[PDB]
Amino acid sequence: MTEYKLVVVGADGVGKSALTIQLIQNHFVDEYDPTIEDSYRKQVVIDGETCLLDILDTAGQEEYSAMRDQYMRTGEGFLCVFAINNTKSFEDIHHYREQIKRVKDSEDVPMVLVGNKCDLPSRTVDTKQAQDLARSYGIPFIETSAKTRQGVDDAFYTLVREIRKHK
Ligand SMILES: Nc1nc2c(ncn2[C@@H]2O[C@H](COP(=O)(O)OP(=O)(O)CP(=O)(O)O)[C@@H](O)[C@H]2O)c(=O)[nH]1
Ligand SMILES: [Mg+2]
Q1: Cα separation, 73 vs 143, whole angstroms
Q2: Whose CA is nearest to atom 29 of ligand 1?
Q3: N6-acetyllysine occurs at which residues?
Q4: Ligand 1, atom 17, residue with closest C-alpha
Q5: Got the DSSP string for 20-59?
Q6: Cα–Cα distances in angstroms (integers) from residue 15 to residues 33, 101, 151, in the given order
Q7: Helices 93-104 & 127-137, crossing angle to 10 degrees?
Q8: What is the largest CA-CA distance in the chain?
Q9: Which of 7, 53, 134, 138 has its CA 20 to 30 A from that of 98?
Q10: 3-state secondary structure of 65
Q11: Of the bound ligands, which one is closest to the alpha carbon of residue 143?
Q12: What's the angle, vertex CA 121, arms to CA 86 and CA 87, rounded to 5?
């Protein structure tokens, strides 16, 4: 069975944990319980192939930034999440991408840019600006909501497809 090592990264509060829990458990977490580091393993069928997804749900709190080196070395693909109502979280994407590129010594690391909380009316990052950033990196971009499940399966499955091409 093919195993995919996915790592979910992004600023504190963007919805990394809510996206992961929505994907796996099909329910939305309203509370804000900051993460240190959680991991999940789930079997799913993607494009007719039974896949084992290893999902690492990382800390957005900068206090845990020293843990990034290990997960960036081990991870095969990265879900780079910002929230569409948090401009700082969008600005922080570039830092996560440079860090990943440095650790893996490559400009071709599987990544997907995710603009989460698309159910909210309080947008501060236009879809076009995020699509332009993703085009500059050569990676896919999808908007998601951990509350409604919009784009959630597509975001994770797209990241798996980005890893799979290299095999
Ligand atoms: N409306 C809405 N709220 C969301 C969405 N995703 C997460 N939230 C809310 O945002 C808050 C933070 O979500 P959480 O999943 O804990 O974020 P995180 O990025 O894991 C936080 P940390 O980096 O500290 O672990 C919570 O109140 C959660 O309900 C979403 O798509 N829509
Ligand atoms: Mg979390």
Answers
A1: 27
A2: 30
A3: 104
A4: 15
A5: HHHHHHS----S----SEEEEEEEEEETTEEEEEEEEEE-
A6: 11, 23, 13
A7: 10
A8: 42
A9: 53
A10: helix
A11: 1
A12: 15
Pocket residues: Cβ below 6 A from ligand 1: 12-18, 29-30, 32-35, 59-61, 116-117, 119-120, 145-147
Rounded distance between C-alpha atoms, residue 31 and residue 29, angstroms: 6
CB contact at 8 A, 113 and 48: no
* Superfamily in which the 1-167 domain is placed by CATH: P-loop containing nucleotide triphosphate hydrolases (3.40.50.300)
Residue 113: both structure tokens together: 């840019």
Place of tokens 């896919």: 140
Of all protein residues, the one whose alpha carbon is nearest to atom 13 of ligand 1 is 15
Q: Write down the experimental method used for this entry.
A: X-ray
> Which residues lie across from 53 on neighbouring strands?
4, 42
Distance 117 CA to ligand 1 centre (A): 8
